[PDB]
Amino acid sequence: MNYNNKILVSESGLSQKHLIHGDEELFQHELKTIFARNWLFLTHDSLIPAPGDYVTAKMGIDEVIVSRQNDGSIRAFLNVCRHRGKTLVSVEAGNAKGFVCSYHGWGFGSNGELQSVPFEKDLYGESLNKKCLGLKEVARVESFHGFIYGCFDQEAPPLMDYLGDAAWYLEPMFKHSGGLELVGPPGKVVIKANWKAPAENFVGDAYHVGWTHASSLRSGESIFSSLAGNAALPPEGAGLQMTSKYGSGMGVLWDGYSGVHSADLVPELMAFGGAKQERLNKEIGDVRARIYRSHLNCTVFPNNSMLTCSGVFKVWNPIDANTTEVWTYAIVEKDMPEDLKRRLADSVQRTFGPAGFWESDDNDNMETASQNGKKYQSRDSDLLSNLGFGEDVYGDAVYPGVVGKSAIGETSYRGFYRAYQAHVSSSNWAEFEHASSTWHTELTKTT
Amino acid sequence: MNYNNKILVSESGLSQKHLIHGDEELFQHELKTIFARNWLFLTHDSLIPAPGDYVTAKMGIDEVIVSRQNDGSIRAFLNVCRHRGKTLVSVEAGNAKGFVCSYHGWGFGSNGELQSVPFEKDLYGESLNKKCLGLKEVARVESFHGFIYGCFDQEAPPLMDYLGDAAWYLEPMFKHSGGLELVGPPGKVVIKANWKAPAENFVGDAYHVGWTHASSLRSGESIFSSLAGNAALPPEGAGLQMTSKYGSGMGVLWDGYSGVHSADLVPELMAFGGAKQERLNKEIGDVRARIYRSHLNCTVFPNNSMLTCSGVFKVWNPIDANTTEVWTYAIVEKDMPEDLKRRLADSVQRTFGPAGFWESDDNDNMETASQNGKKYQSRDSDLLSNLGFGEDVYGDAVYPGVVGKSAIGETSYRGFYRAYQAHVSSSNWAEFEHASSTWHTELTKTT
Amino acid sequence: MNYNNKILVSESGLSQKHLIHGDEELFQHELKTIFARNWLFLTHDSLIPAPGDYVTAKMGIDEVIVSRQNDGSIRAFLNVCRHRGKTLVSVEAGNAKGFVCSYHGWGFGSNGELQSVPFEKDLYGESLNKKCLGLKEVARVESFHGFIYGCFDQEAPPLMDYLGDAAWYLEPMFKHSGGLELVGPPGKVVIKANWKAPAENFVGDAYHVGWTHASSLRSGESIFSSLAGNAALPPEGAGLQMTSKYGSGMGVLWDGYSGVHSADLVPELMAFGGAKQERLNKEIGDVRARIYRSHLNCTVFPNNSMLTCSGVFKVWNPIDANTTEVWTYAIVEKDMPEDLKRRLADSVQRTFGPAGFWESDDNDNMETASQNGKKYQSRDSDLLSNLGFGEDVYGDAVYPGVVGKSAIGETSYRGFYRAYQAHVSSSNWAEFEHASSTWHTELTKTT
Amino acid sequence: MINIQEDKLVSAHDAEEILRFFNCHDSALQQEATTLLTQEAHLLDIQAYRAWLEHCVGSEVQYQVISRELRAASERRYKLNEAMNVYNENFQQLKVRVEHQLDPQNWGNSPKLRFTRFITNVQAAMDVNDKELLHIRSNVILHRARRGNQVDVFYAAREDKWKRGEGGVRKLVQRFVDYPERILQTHNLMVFL
Amino acid sequence: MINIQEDKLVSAHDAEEILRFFNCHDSALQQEATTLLTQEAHLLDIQAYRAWLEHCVGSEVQYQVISRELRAASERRYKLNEAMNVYNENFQQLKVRVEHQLDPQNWGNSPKLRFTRFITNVQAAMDVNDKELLHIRSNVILHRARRGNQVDVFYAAREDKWKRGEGGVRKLVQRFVDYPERILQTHNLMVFL
Amino acid sequence: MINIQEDKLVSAHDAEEILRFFNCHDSALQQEATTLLTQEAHLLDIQAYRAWLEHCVGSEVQYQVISRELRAASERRYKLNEAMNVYNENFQQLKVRVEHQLDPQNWGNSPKLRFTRFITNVQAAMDVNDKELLHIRSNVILHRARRGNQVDVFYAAREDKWKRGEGGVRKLVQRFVDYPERILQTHNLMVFL
């Protein structure tokens, strides 16, 4: 398949070929053009706060060690010994000043440097160039209010610029709330879906909630429950959708601060967010203060998703075209009382974790849609993402990005897939920019 | 591999390269040139008799919904939602006026039409082109005396023409018997063999019976049991073999109406078939009446096999080069007494179903022959199908097709594989016809 | 990937691309250029001593029957029926004058010849060319002091020449000891590593022993135990490393006759080997007699490894790039007392068999190093084998081959991988010779 | 106990079986049933098929294993054959299967297969009407291993009826299994559950 | 019995549990516990979730299944959350899960799932301080089969506390499972262990 | 019971073992054996290897697990070593294995492994000649889980001999397992069955 010319995503992101969820050659190509090119979630400050603390994380199919340095910075390295390539670290988290290889005993520091080699003098004499034998380092590591991302490409735009217009929406909760913490360890489960299936679902899919989650809505009695079984749709002005140049996007459901939480937490949360909102009105304005306590369903391109307020934080780690390893953390506001932090974290897992009853509702949808992408008669078929097309705007006076002023639509799918075409058909970051020079015009076309 | 030029099947079908049972690139190519081009078994009238009744079936690796329309016709559609591609129907059979997608709730009628979209007016307004969003329809659906077949290619020949010379042999049992019913549900088992291994075995392999099935013959005391352990071969005139232009073929074992049934059913069956035969003598002639009560081991190209009289009906559903999903139904004559219908169905499963003791004898043969096709030193080796070559005839005054007037031989393998070369090396139905313009001459050559 | 030009192994074997342990296209290519070209271990005389005795063995991914002929020779044939390709023999060992196919009953002799076909006269008449239907024969089968190897390529050099300089080292134990026997049956276990990972470990890796096997050394109290946890390195003159033109190589640890055996056997073995050594001094000289009772860790290119004295004998049978089936036998000296033979065999399995505690230490090393070869950021990375480079010699007056006069180094890796480049980049044995005309110069370069 | 109008996922058949075991508990009977099933499984595991037939299986036996078609939980109109019989054997039919297993030309039995059975969750209750009959429920994991690297594991619940017999030799008169996997991934179901 | 300074791989928690069962053995209690667990598993296997809640689960229940992060055996400095709760349910939270299972719009439950549970290694010991409470340890293999070819098998050890209740109806007051697989390969853990 | 001339697939060894258990049944002994094996498995599952050695394993123990070569059912001439010993350990050899498991430089044990054992089908019979010795047969499913996504499941039947010991502490004097899978697909067999 010639990725320079193949139309995998139509103009304006209106449709995508179903094969993108099943083609293994394309998956291999995404390793290069998506995962080795873009910003990927690694960890949070709250998980590695002290010097020597480390965690392992995936970046695409690669595994890296993410380590807090003595100077307070964070560096990340491939979890692969420079000698004969054994995996260096076999645990998920810890504290150490270095890592020693269990094969021949080479010892690397938390800074990636080759520090010791068994019997170096008797064996290598002075012939070993240790300075050129440090662990392979992740070129770029940057923080968005404690959330640490990595990128293998030195040509990538800075993380803040990469978030583009989505950043404005995240800032009330990520910055002005006083800060978030990630509660680990994450749940980890393998699903038989392509990584794009959950990514697209979280980036822009409010349409599925009432039907897919009818049973969960009915049973949990959460605030969004009026939608169970499409018994009712919300108010035209119940929310909005947005997308951005580099692919990130989100849905906004006004005021839904308790999110997917069952009625047992709704009162405490609605009180907490409302009180903080009242203070934020004076600091960032009424609109941004309301955004703080509004439910955002977001995907940070390519494979990091979250539900603010609900506090669900996901990484869709690719394994192959029909396999993904799902990591689920909870996000909590740092100044929430400890007991509320604990209950919210359990509720995140209760709804969206390994035994999450809401997440279970989505399984078959993601898995079968992905697997059908392999089936002969569906490969060349078109997945549709035209809902709301030609009503999106950009450069709005209040809400930035390409924006659909409706709660339910497919604006965010269109922006995600537009960014995806541009990457798959480009050899580098300069070519992606050239392919994206009229990104918002392409997305708003007929309006 | 260049399928235009590669000789996978030698001239006259005398041999085939062993790689055809193991090569995954070829399997992918067969999806296009075999499964998307030819007629495939779907279901029987007896399984979906009333309006709204439906079943799911595979067509190659694709899954389709097969539905009885209000006007009495049958239509089939890909089991894939036109929105984001989720599998629509998760059950194997039922009755419904439509199918609703569990992802976002789109509702399709039993006629494939997009009938409802949740909140269509508030979301899509009048922008949604529902008329162009019906389920993807199987182009061709035709019946052979209640047996329903599908074809994705509008250029295919009609089913009756596609059956060619084999049809004459099937008609006594399928038409003149008063009609057959298929007793469901089928047994379903995955085997680690290529779909062609059982297809070839059923189309033309009587040679294996005495040896492969020695233990089953000995234990079951069925009518064919004299062959156990090759203790004896039958009479030169005990049967015949035939094959046809489009690949279908069969063996005929004269008078073997009780087939593989153990002695507990032999008397009742031999009485039943003999009485019907006596009536058919006057209607269709002595030869065709005898064919009615003669055991036919047939494959309807490419992957539908059956044993008449025994009442075994199989679909060899392809999964990959060394994986096949085997579906086993029983066929019974409609005018047989109900209690006999029940006992015959259980006996079909007893011998050839998921715990079928005869079918078990064949497992290792099919699996290892298929898997050996992947082994380096066997890929380019030749599987032999020369038994009986240069003694076959065609245009015989009594028995149509390319015919070997012996019970045991490889005539039917040669015709099956000739049709297979022609398809794999052709881009369409016109090219297959051009490649097949001297089909019977190629098969009878040296006679 | 163009194997003619791709540098998978750098000059002098100093490094290899990590992808060689994970690339499936390369694995397929090795089937042709490594496994179908070189000498592969089959069995030992002691396992098939009498006429009619046979065993099955793998040669790459192919399975062969290895059979003792009436004249005392050994012939080997593909374990595949010449008719429709079913696996002929389903057991691992036995005694028989022929093999009959369970599909249609064709009978082949122990000499590969098609001897009988059921009902040949009635079915094939005189048309069947049985003389051209014998089993596909392994072109070359040769013995090294009872150890039987096969090669599919008639152009291969004789086995003794193929062993090159390594043969001199093996001869004291394989020839002058009075002969070895292989004690079967082997242990058989699948590991998720490339076949090259254990091959390289056994051919030249003494560096790992102290660290990888720290726990086994400490617990078993074997003679090599001073190295546990790199608590100490041996004496500069504690051994040597060697490699040869065709890829075979080994480590030599002077005097370590009890090898990996726990203290319960150390006294008996050290007494036995020392007594034999005293007799061999007069027959083959002091140096070669000492070699006899010295521990050799060897790989006979490509995938046969052994530890003399310890008595461990391995075949690393390739399944795919990250799957290998490990066969473990024990080797014993024929003139050892029977009870000692039995105890040594159990100890071989205790340490290196399916529940071998030493072998367990190596699992993760081999598996993760292999699997990391598939990971995007490691494919093009370099596995290092430079230890000792530019201190190796060749044409030494006492010790033949390319030799590193140190116990621990990477000489043998360099020779193994040099032979590997030469094969992967060559279409035949003549091209390998052309590519190898300055093999030892390439390996000793900077000295 | 159960009310299937409220416990919406429960079938009437399943609810009847729970009623049978929850009522009268006879600890001694449970232990006797456990021993009986353990002995039966031992005979099967060593492939003593004739001994199993002679010592464990009654002349009036119905040995039945079904595969049910997947239907919508909300289905109520489609009324055609709901299941099919993988096994539905009388004594003579079992005997035919045993002869097939023991025939020296059963090529698939060389090299010898290896079976290991795990029987758990044994419950027993006397029949209310026929005092010769005991209801026994048990679950089985059956592991088959053949030809070096073929491994098939079966899982099921068994609803049995055993008769007291003569001489303390209890014999199976009915075994019913509703096999839980609709598409088998074990090559076949040619094992005695 | 155990000394964890010598038995270096044993956790203090695990050593406490062995002490509890090795001490006083009450054969009758073991058999009672076996029956109780077999009955509970039967109710779950037939998807009688409301009956399970009503007959087997106490109002004060804590139903907890954790997933522990992989840490070095030699770790001793890193002190942040060691596990996470796949389940940490009170009675009302279990009831929400049961309602979700029984809702006719739970699309994933059509066609009906098939469950088979195998309970083994039952041990029982009375609580030293609270005579209403019984400690029960058991291991479970749980087999789930759905949609033709989906098969998921779960394995775990369960540390339970059951109360005597009223009328002989024992009820679960605590279930604790430390799930042994860190990365699940069963699509989810939406099963009641 | 069995006649191996008629039950053609049954080995003489297997037929001898059936005879041993079918004869005298001692319900109390079965229950005692069940408790013993459950306690042993608990110690192993928590990796209390030293405690297992001290509390469960006799000084005269032979702990043997074999792998038999695949041979034709009709073979009768080829007479060379039929099996090989995956394990054939005396007490000291078991102790070496236990020390290896507990060594802090056993890198493969970090992060800590997770074991879960399921023991079923327990049968027990006193030795006819040596009154200190009890024959116990049981089947085991052993589940190993390590390093996030490595899962290995083992299946086997165990033929044991246990001695009465002193103080009620029964100890294993012989364990024999004929491992049913010829080619292991579990990375290794480094587990105590």
Ligand SMILES: c1ccc2[nH]ccc2c1
């Ligand atoms: C609430 C609202 C919108 C959403 N999109 C994906 C999950 C989700 C939850």
Ligand SMILES: c1ccc2[nH]ccc2c1
């Ligand atoms: C009876 C006769 C001929 C046959 N070919 C394949 C099955 C079969 C059964």
Ligand SMILES: c1ccc2[nH]ccc2c1
């Ligand atoms: C002893 C010495 C050197 C070695 N290399 C590989 C195994 C081994 C054992």
Ligand code: FES
């Ligand atoms: S592979 Fe790490 S020290 Fe050798």
Ligand code: FES
């Ligand atoms: S995928 Fe079917 S309605 Fe959306």
Ligand code: FES
């Ligand atoms: S495949 Fe061997 S005789 Fe036919």
Ligand SMILES: [Fe+3]
């Ligand atoms: Fe959702």
Ligand SMILES: [Fe+3]
């Ligand atoms: Fe057959």
Ligand SMILES: [Fe+3]
């Ligand atoms: Fe080693």
